[PDB]
């Protein structure tokens, strides 16, 4: 139903 993968990625965690 939803896509939140970018927001829980290792990349996001680094910001």
């Amino acid at each position, epitope marked *: 139903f939803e*896509d*939140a993968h*970018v927001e829980h990625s*290792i*990349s996001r965690s*680094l910001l």
Partner: antibody
Amino acid sequence: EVQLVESGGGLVQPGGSLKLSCATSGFPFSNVWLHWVRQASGKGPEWVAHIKAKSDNYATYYAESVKGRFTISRDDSKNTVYLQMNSLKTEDTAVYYCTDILEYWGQGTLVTVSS
Amino acid sequence: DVVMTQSPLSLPVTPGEPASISCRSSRSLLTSKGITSLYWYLQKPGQSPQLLIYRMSNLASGIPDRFSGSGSGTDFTLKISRVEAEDVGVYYCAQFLVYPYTFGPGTKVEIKR
């Protein structure tokens, strides 16, 4: 620097068990979603399992071919994610990757299921 | 399920010319928030898959802007404006929306000579 390091692969007999581990470092672990993805030689990637974070009550999701046999789990205090594999079949033979599914993928660990 | 398909299976490209490969999903990958859950990867032998384009059209960091992605609903296209040598490998599309998450079968891009 970001590191995802799989281990635990090897040769195992059909119907046997194996636990894969994925040790990680270099990034805050608590709110990162993680996956296991596998790949047999000459074939494309196949998603295996997905585990969310404590905030998400560690919800888990599984590929049709592994339901009831594999368990994905994580230990936030050790920045490690795991894949427990029971009742293994020859068709489970593959390289197993841990990854956030996006920019970061480990090097993979090879699992061979055979007598 | 959602099944992902791709064409062609193989694509020889003369260096410096464009490449275009297609992907299709069996249902729409638009989410309620306008995001399209479609992702493109390049995989070279012995390496893990490399993300090139995320959510249909966004270039991943460090990826040359020779790569671009577009789509209309269920049909998606990856383009390389001019092929360079490091571009060879197998290109996969994938959807991360409907929970049996799935990858396409791959398109092998080779250098024509």
